[PDB]
Amino acid sequence: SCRCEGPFYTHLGAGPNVAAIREIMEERFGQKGKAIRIERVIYTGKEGKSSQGCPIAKWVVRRSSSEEKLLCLVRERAGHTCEAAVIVILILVWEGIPLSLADKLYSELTETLRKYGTLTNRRCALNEERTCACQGLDPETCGASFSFGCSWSMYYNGCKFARSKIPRKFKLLGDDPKEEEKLESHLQNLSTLMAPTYKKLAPDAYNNQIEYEHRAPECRLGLKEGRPFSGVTACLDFCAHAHRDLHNMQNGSTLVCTLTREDNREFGGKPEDEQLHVLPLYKVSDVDEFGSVEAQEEKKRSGAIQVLSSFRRKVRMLAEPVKTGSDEVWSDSEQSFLDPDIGGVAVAPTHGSILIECAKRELHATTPLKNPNRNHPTRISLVFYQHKSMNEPKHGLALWEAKMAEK
DNA sequence: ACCACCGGTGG
DNA sequence: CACCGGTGGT
Ligand SMILES: O=C(O)CNC(=O)C(=O)O
Ligand SMILES: [Fe+2]
Ligand SMILES: [Zn+2]
Ligand SMILES: [Zn+2]
Ligand SMILES: [Zn+2]
Predict the structure, then answer these.
(1) Using the CB atom, is residue A182 less than 7 Å from strand C?
(2) Which region holds residue A127: left if phi is over 0, alpha if psi is between -120 and 50, else beta?
(3) Which of A61, A77, A245, A337 is 20 to 30 Å from A162 by CA-CA measure?
């Protein structure tokens, strides 16, 4: 209840002040002090974008040291003094899965998806004018998104598998059952590993996604009781333009596991290239977690908060909209950088890291790669989610069979 | 409003 | 190659 600004929700969760969040996260993660970093971010509502307008970052929150284990972005709600005055927006576990696992997933998923992977077009693959080339213009190499598990379907108002006699949640090109089983095993195993981390760090969101686990098990991933996830998307060097995951269930979240190219697996030192995760409607604070101006200035000079970097680069523009050859034009971010209130708070997720955010409510995006290449990607993101209305047994078979019966 | 959306099956 | 039809967002 409230009687006292951006989307309001508390399932990640929330408290009367920044200090309360620290207690909450210290309790959840188990460690105290340095291990947990909290950045205050400010919702401006003014979207950061290039002149074209594709995703851009204005600030990059980077892991400060090996000591930093948990990053939490918090939004202090303008004018509130209640028990949910400050809410958690993003949680990032730098050391999310074992590094040997992360190395092995990188290789295996890249190899499997490049040869047997089947494309999944998405509106967020393109800018508003549907004329950009953020993915790269080589069909064999361009960044791409692949969708697996279950997903919601307007045609059934439920799982897309409502008619499927034994559906293939991990359909690869053509036929090969053995390749699909191998891909299934990796992502099933990873789903299984990630659930307890999700329970631990975002229990309220985890609990919501678990409610109907026993009613619709056919629409859940994972091999062990506690199955919050329904679908997985693999994004290889994919530039996701600013969007919200509107199909996701209410009061849940998305877990994003990041895998990086081999030149970007050591703490510190720059790889080139690098893909960023962006909240285009936020700016960073004047002040650090505990309210010190000097402290936040130190982070800026040390690079824990990297202040970008207005650019003027050259890029491709398609002569005709994709609509569901090209010319060079130069892209600019001068205007987003002129306005202190135009947002673009980004994080640089590491190899093996796990990012938690309410992707349904928060506008978000990933930056385009300099030279996208899905066959040897700079970044692979593994995005775990549950869509709305995935609460019926057997992929909603009964419902549709019954709805068509009355006709 | 109203355009435009992380597919599948039978034929 | 053609039916099935929910709903946020500028
Ligand atoms: O790649 C991640 O950081 C973000 N992924 C998405 O926003 C998505 O595919 O819906
Ligand atoms: Fe998304
Ligand atoms: Zn673009
Ligand atoms: Zn309040
Ligand atoms: Zn299903």
Answers:
(1) no
(2) beta
(3) A245
Whole-angstrom Cα distance, residue A56 to residue A245?
19
**Per-residue DSSP letters for A28-71?**
HHS--GGGEEEEEEEE--B----TT-----SEEE----TT--EE
Pairwise CA distance, residues A155 & A395, whole Å: 13
Q: From residue A35, how far is each of A68, A94, A285, A350 by CA, in Å?
A: 5, 10, 20, 16
- Is any atom of strand B within 7 angstroms of residue A404's beta carbon? no
CA dist A61 to A71, A180, A304, A321, Å? 9, 37, 6, 34
Q: Name the residue among A234, A273, A279 with its Cα closest to residue A380.
A: A234
Structural domain span for residue A35: 2-407
- For residue A103, is the peptide bond before it cis, meaning its omega torsion is within 30 degrees of 0? no
List the determination method: X-ray
For chain A residues 347-376, those near strand B by a CB cutoff of 7 A are: 359
- What is the C-alpha separation between A200 and A28, in angstroms, rounded? 6
Q: Per the structure, how many domains does chain A have?
A: 1
**Ligand 1 pocket, residue A256 CB under 6 Å:** yes
Ligand 1: which residue has its CA nearest to atom 10? A245
Closest CA to A171 of A116, A247, A237, A223: A116
On chain C, which bases lie within 7 A of the protein's CB atoms?
Answer: 4-9
- A125 alpha carbon, closest ligand: 3
Please name the amino acid found at residue A188.
Q
- Please work out, in degrees rounded to the nearest 5, the angle formed at the alpha carbon of residue A289 by the alpha carbons of A204 and A44: 75
Q: Is A183 in the pocket of ligand 1 (CB under 6 A)?
A: no
Q: Whose CA is nearest to atom 2 of ligand 1?
A: A381
Give A384's strand partners. A232, A255
Task: State if residue A236 touches ligand 1 by the CB under 6 angstroms criterion.
Answer: no
